[PDB]
Scaffold this active site. Structure first.
Site, mmCIF file in Angstrom:
data_model
loop_
_atom_site.group_PDB
_atom_site.id
_atom_site.type_symbol
_atom_site.label_atom_id
_atom_site.label_comp_id
_atom_site.label_asym_id
_atom_site.label_seq_id
_atom_site.Cartn_x
_atom_site.Cartn_y
_atom_site.Cartn_z
ATOM 1 N N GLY C 61 -4.125 -1.408 -4.464
ATOM 2 C CA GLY C 61 -5.389 -1.276 -3.900
ATOM 3 C C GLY C 61 -5.914 -2.115 -2.722
ATOM 4 O O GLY C 61 -4.729 -2.487 -1.904
ATOM 5 N N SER C 90 2.532 -2.758 -4.749
ATOM 6 C CA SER C 90 1.711 -3.102 -3.648
ATOM 7 C C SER C 90 1.063 -4.520 -4.001
ATOM 8 O O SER C 90 1.584 -5.284 -4.301
ATOM 9 C CB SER C 90 0.835 -1.783 -3.132
ATOM 10 O OG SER C 90 1.631 -0.806 -2.844
ATOM 11 N N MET C 91 -0.298 -4.334 -3.996
ATOM 12 C CA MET C 91 -0.963 -5.724 -4.144
ATOM 13 C C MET C 91 -0.988 -5.943 -5.536
ATOM 14 O O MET C 91 -1.148 -7.207 -5.864
ATOM 15 C CB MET C 91 -2.370 -5.329 -3.864
ATOM 16 C CG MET C 91 -3.081 -6.712 -3.103
ATOM 17 S SD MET C 91 -2.232 -7.489 -1.907
ATOM 18 C CE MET C 91 -3.359 -8.975 -2.007
ATOM 19 N N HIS C 115 5.744 -2.540 -0.819
ATOM 20 C CA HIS C 115 5.923 -1.903 0.569
ATOM 21 C C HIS C 115 4.981 -2.602 1.576
ATOM 22 O O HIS C 115 4.141 -3.455 1.191
ATOM 23 C CB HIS C 115 5.329 -0.537 0.317
ATOM 24 C CG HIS C 115 3.992 0.016 -0.038
ATOM 25 N ND1 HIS C 115 3.801 1.241 -0.302
ATOM 26 C CD2 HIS C 115 3.074 -0.833 -0.199
ATOM 27 C CE1 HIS C 115 2.794 1.305 -0.633
ATOM 28 N NE2 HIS C 115 1.861 0.171 -0.549
ATOM 29 N N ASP C 164 8.404 2.125 0.830
ATOM 30 C CA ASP C 164 8.357 1.957 -0.529
ATOM 31 C C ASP C 164 9.712 1.576 -1.213
ATOM 32 O O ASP C 164 10.886 2.212 -0.970
ATOM 33 C CB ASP C 164 7.912 3.274 -1.102
ATOM 34 C CG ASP C 164 6.454 3.746 -1.011
ATOM 35 O OD1 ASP C 164 5.958 2.878 -0.105
ATOM 36 O OD2 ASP C 164 6.011 4.891 -1.483
#
Ligand SMILES: CC[C@H](C)[C@H]1C(=O)N([C@H](C)c2cccc3ccccc23)C[C@@H]2N(C(=O)NCCCC(F)(F)F)CCC(=O)N12
Ligand SMILES: CC[C@H](C)[C@H]1C(=O)N([C@H](C)c2cccc3ccccc23)C[C@@H]2N(C(=O)NCCCC(F)(F)F)CCC(=O)N12
Ligand SMILES: CC[C@H](C)[C@H]1C(=O)N([C@H](C)c2cccc3ccccc23)C[C@@H]2N(C(=O)NCCCC(F)(F)F)CCC(=O)N12
Ligand SMILES: CC[C@H](C)[C@H]1C(=O)N([C@H](C)c2cccc3ccccc23)C[C@@H]2N(C(=O)NCCCC(F)(F)F)CCC(=O)N12
Ligand SMILES: CC[C@H](C)[C@H]1C(=O)N([C@H](C)c2cccc3ccccc23)C[C@@H]2N(C(=O)NCCCC(F)(F)F)CCC(=O)N12
Ligand SMILES: CC[C@H](C)[C@H]1C(=O)N([C@H](C)c2cccc3ccccc23)C[C@@H]2N(C(=O)NCCCC(F)(F)F)CCC(=O)N12
Ligand SMILES: [Mg+2]
Ligand SMILES: [Mg+2]
Ligand SMILES: [Mg+2]
Ligand SMILES: [Mg+2]
Ligand SMILES: [Mg+2]
Ligand SMILES: [Mg+2]
Ligand SMILES: [Mg+2]
Ligand SMILES: [Mg+2]
Ligand SMILES: [Mg+2]
Ligand SMILES: [Mg+2]
Lengths: 181, 182, 184, 185, 179, 177, 185, 187, 185
Positions: C61, C90-91, C115, C164
């Site tokens: 997010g 991600s985060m 990513h 990704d």
């Protein structure tokens, strides 16, 4: 619902140098009217043109496309207000050849200050405000020249919606005569 | 002039006299039409002037360049006349008319500003889109400099935000050559 | 459907928080970050020496919200263990890698994805430029920290996050994103 | 309309069942549901690391990664987790049913079990589509391998049997190795 | 929903469960949990299942059905207002001799409803599944009512509305409760 | 809602039917009736009715529960009782059905819908006609009016004053201040 | 769209250009646009199998299969098809630009050319996603192979250069081999 | 933007009408009842004009209604003239079925045209017996399609069943090897 | 995209109408019925003795609109041949069966479907009753006429139209809905 004569009805009127401004003024309408004025001047640079106006107004720049084309061409452009001329519509009514600006007796004329909008950063809002204020000064100056009224009176009288009868429009200097039956 | 609005139509009648009307937002359809008209007129007569009337708020830069490049490519001079408004790519096209034959009517408005766009996705995609729109702005500014006589640096500064010019100011700027008085 | 337990009434998450367990089980936005930051702050004040356990099942997010959590983890005295269960993308995977060295875990079938950051920009050319410069700087910041946390070079991180990149728990360990896969 | 029961300690009905080590998976599996169930499993292990836990499953399935959060937590904790299919266990629901402690996976007689291949999506450039395809194929291999280990069926049979929606009665689920017993009344 | 406990919780204290809505997974989970709770409180005292329901999910209905049959206490069923579709199936599932309706209650039986979309073979799978589900429902209905599977098939082909008395004659309930 | 006020009234054996009748409302009212009978099988219950009506089967859940329990259920129409609401008003214990003077009572035939094949439309038509016969028969028993008169008087929306409702036999008394 | 009259035979402007063997691809490429352009090419070759055709391209691209309808029709007919990029040729637009007769592919100086990998979507079961991935990868190989043949660049360079959006000036497009000449004023 | 062409008496035609004058029919969209009715009418017109000269059916279509497709199919087989089929761009589903239905020896594709075959798609909602009827109907429709495809391609019904279970994309050359077309037209 | 033919100028359907061919190629509503009725009336006035040809590819539609067409067919002097191509369902199949005896056809892969009429009703009990009585009478009327046209009993028609009943062309012939299947030359 636009009938034919053996030309659509509007085309037939254009053959007799009559242009109908019968809607909101936007860029399409202005382009059409400008093109009609240009065509009619080329057909005959000396005979009068007749511009019928029943319009609630619209785009100021589109209105000025029409205005400047009227003043540029050689033929006199008569203006006749039928129904309503409001805002830029009434500005165009007042722009007809001097002595040849008319309204029918029950036609309504409305004058007011220009409308607009702006969104975004403070400096963007400032630019938009400055622009619309300059546009108002330009409109008022020309209206003063066309009516004989002072810029100060025009400013005051356009602060809010100001509805005029045909006779009041004549007294104001927006038109020259009310055409009685 | 069979109908005013749908040489049958009024625009077609004007085209017969080498007059093209750019009276809307510039998108690919409008550009394709105007390009086709320019091509037709050159083939009819490669020496007589063409007249491009401009009342436009602007629009697509690439569509604008379709028109621009076609103007420069053809042999006839293309006169430009601003009536109402020429903004953004509209004012770019106004400035692109044959030198000495770019006009505006006295109450016409000219507006110049930087190009608008968007980018969405990964960081490297945003970078590619940013680089592209910056290069597009440099290309526009360079050509505007050549057409106006103003420096690239002045054009950059003056297009940072919406900049509205009167017809007379557009002449002083070098966007047009003359204001047509009545 | 969040159940209660009585020993004093607690919802299940509050009960886990009593044992120094924080659950990051959603998309990371400002609300989630504020809650997790508050939990970390509370736990440090209760005991500045005992380990905290941060469970991570998150698709990622907001990067700035993620950094609120990241910086709070590094700021407090207690070690924050990280455990990836389900997915850390991600985060989410950035936060997984941010746990105390030696105390970053995943369960065997957990998925880790890395990513480059995502974003958007609309408006004038100079506005697009500002947004592009900002997201590029944000990527450099993320990559630099990921390099420090994993032992991988910045150049390798750049290449491996271009698209990704899905990792098994074991691959995440080999990469240096975690220290151990917890076997049953 | 979730009712309360008073032991005066007040509990909603699900909280009351949790007190007896019963967890209800009664919905689609998403990240919220997984987080709740994981938290419940963790709580129950800490309360008692030796007593059985009971996972009721009436679920059409849902997120594979959320399902794996639950799966891995089940295998990680010390207590046996019994699974009981009531109504329906489909997709990741049936995967979780099969993941219960060996010998303690049940269904009631009219419960439905459905197995099928994972579902997903991919959008964008060719190479992005390729990455997404490779990922979902690897996920399917992972699911199938584990299902093979839990059922005693070969990976090849699992692949064939999950190609399309495959509905099983409770008795067929037992014969397949997804559960150990059908609970008769 | 008034307090005394909310009203439903108060009834649950006296072993009364209210099925007063469409049957979905949430409703089934709640009712299953209530049945489980009540059995643990007392494995011998009767439970009372009030049914006013237009029906709903077949699998959710079977969650309730199987839980009723699994637990030790008898579950009485009482139809008040309407029991349609899976609602009437659950009415018929109460302990033999303890299935009731009030005199103006409506019972409706019909075949299951569903959908299928996609490839021909997917449509085939969905068709086979819903047909098997109907056979399962009809078989159980036959066992609970004493009617043949063939009669149940014919009588559920379309919406079939029964009075309380007709439901008794059919074998869906045992008695109509007169005032 | 400010015990909440409705719970406080329920403590004095007052049930408020103050909305459209659907399955939720019926389930609540049925549960309240059941609770009150168990608390005291001999003391009167008071059912306040301000309702535009609603589901017929939900209405019958309430109706049958009223007739099943031992205590008398008084009915009081305040504001409006229409359709199924007026049916429930008429279902109160004989001699204990009331309305306040400006309360409105409306009776009409049941409403519904049907879509699909001809035979499906037929089934739905037969069902709603049987439902109307059932309603009319019971209304006849409760009011003393013939089934034929009830049929005619419910063909369209028929609005009654409190006094007219009394003359009709839907209630026993208008409560003057 | 304005009319032009020959003295009265009436043509819209595009029809008038078609009379001089000029086809205008001035929009997104979809099946309707491809069908129209294919029909125009077919008409033109029947009218005169030896005179050049002129394909104007101002297009952001669009459907790959629609693009190939146009591409294959160009290569199938006997007349040379000149291509001229005006404004923008992106994606399948730039592919068609490069497909014009060798030596007769042009752009005006400020025209933009963009090349990138194909875009798509897939949703459903793992095996459906796999099929869609394999298909779009094969489509990319086909596009790249043809672009290699038309430009003189290697397949490996084309793969690398189309990985992301790659914007070229007219002059850069010439250096790349996508066009043969920039038409200077 | 459908252009006009003027022949030299002078005649004005839209481009599609001009092609129809040379016995070329364009199937360039999704196949629905309107499209089928138009194409059927065109085939009928062309047969009446000349019962011996070939007709050319251009196919760029993602497919569509099976019954609409069969309206076209049966009209092709009913008329006397050979109907050549040419795949340009894409022929998918019922589009590829129609491609295969052209006169033997006169079914073509251009080299980069895409051919896709798969099983028919549909829907059903309502009662169990309604779902059963819809399932039986779509299964019978698939058998009908597969039987005809077997006759047109030379492949067995069993192979066709297997190869259409999922979306199966073929190059023009693969379509020729399969028997869906006779020749790839090379430039 | 309805093409023109020049003898003027005719659209393709107008050209077919010149040869006494009417195309019923859509859902039957009042507009379609009015058009087809007008065509039948025109053709009878042109020639009261030559056959008319009604092609039918229709999923059905309005019963009253269908009866406008039906009654006009029976009223006019010329025989109206019917040919089912693609599909004739519901009122479409009713019209197929209404063609002149001996001159009702289908092509071999054409589908014929018969079923009971569909409708709706909303409002008061007595309004629902009126609508039910009306649609039941409409069904009796349809079934009676279908019996006369096919040679099947009203009772058999009632049973066979209870649900959607799909027939092959050959089955439609055996049923009496058509007289012949037109096999390929
Ligand atoms: C299975 C757990 C094993 C005994 C172990 C462990 O692996 N984790 C990890 C680090 C963990 C953290 C957060 C969420 C987890 C979810 C599932 C499995 C492990 C999790 C946390 C766990 N801890 C606790 O479980 N503490 C008691 C908490 C009781 C209550 F709050 F009620 F849950 C911390 C000490 C420890 O040894 N473990
Ligand atoms: C009818 C149940 C039979 C006596 C038995 C059983 O079959 N199950 C199964 C495995 C079960 C688990 C979870 C949900 C269930 C729902 C319905 C039926 C069985 C369920 C669990 C069940 N258990 C309990 O019911 N414990 C008390 C919980 C009471 C309260 F929490 F209040 F609901 C564990 C001991 C046991 O013998 N059973
Ligand atoms: C005077 C006949 C009665 C009312 C009798 C009865 O018929 N029912 C049936 C079975 C019943 C069950 C559920 C809902 C009902 C609703 C209305 C009428 C009967 C219902 C239940 C009812 N029971 C109770 O009323 N228990 C006392 C607790 C009630 C409350 F306060 F609400 F908790 C249990 C056994 C019994 O003797 N009856
Ligand atoms: C400015 C054009 C220069 C004289 C030249 C040319 O550059 N093009 C290019 C290839 C061209 C093609 C298609 C659209 C174009 C649009 C703008 C500019 C060039 C275009 C084609 C163009 N040709 C024509 O213009 N033929 C007459 C067309 C008449 C009418 F259809 F009415 F427009 C072919 C012979 C030629 O010399 N040129
Ligand atoms: C001069 C080789 C071509 C190109 C060759 C051909 O390949 N096709 C195929 C079968 C075809 C059919 C339909 C549409 C096609 C579109 C593009 C390419 C081939 C097409 C048919 C095509 N035919 C025509 O081109 N007839 C004249 C068309 C006139 C007009 F209508 F004006 F377009 C039939 C005789 C033939 O030899 N061919
Ligand atoms: C089948 C018709 C029978 C021969 C007869 C008839 O019944 N009608 C009725 C009243 C009629 C009127 C309007 C529409 C009708 C549609 C269908 C059938 C009868 C219609 C009028 C009809 N008339 C015509 O058909 N005139 C010629 C038709 C002109 C055109 F359609 F353009 F070709 C007038 C005199 C007459 O003999 N009839
Ligand atoms: Mg003048
Ligand atoms: Mg020039
Ligand atoms: Mg720390
Ligand atoms: Mg375990
Ligand atoms: Mg029991
Ligand atoms: Mg009573
Ligand atoms: Mg060529
Ligand atoms: Mg580049
Ligand atoms: Mg043939
Ligand atoms: Mg006849």
């Amino acid at each position: 619902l636009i009938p034919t004569v053996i030309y659509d009805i509007y085309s037939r009127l254009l053959k007799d140098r009559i242009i109908m401004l019968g809607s909101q003024i936007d860029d399409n309408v202005a382009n059409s009217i400008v093109s009609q004025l240009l065509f009619l001047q080329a057909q005959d640079s000396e005979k009068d043109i007749y511009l019928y106006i029943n319009s609630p107004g619209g785009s100021v720049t589109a209105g000025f496309a029409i205005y400047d084309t009227i003043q540029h061409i050689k033929p006199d452009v008569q203006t006749i207000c039928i129904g309503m001329a409001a805002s830029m519509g009434s500005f165009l009514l007042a722009a007809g050849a001097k002595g040849k600006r008319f309204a029918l007796p029950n036609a309504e004329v409305m004058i007011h200050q220009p409308l607009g909008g702006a969104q975004g950063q403070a400096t963007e809002i400032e630019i938009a405000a400055n622009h619309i204020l300059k546009t108002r000064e330009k409109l008022n100056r020309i209206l003063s020249e066309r009516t004989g009224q002072s810029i100060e009176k025009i400013q005051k009288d356009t602060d809010r919606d100001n509805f005029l009868t045909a006779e009041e429009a004549k007294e104001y200097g927006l038109i020259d005569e009310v055409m009685v039956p």
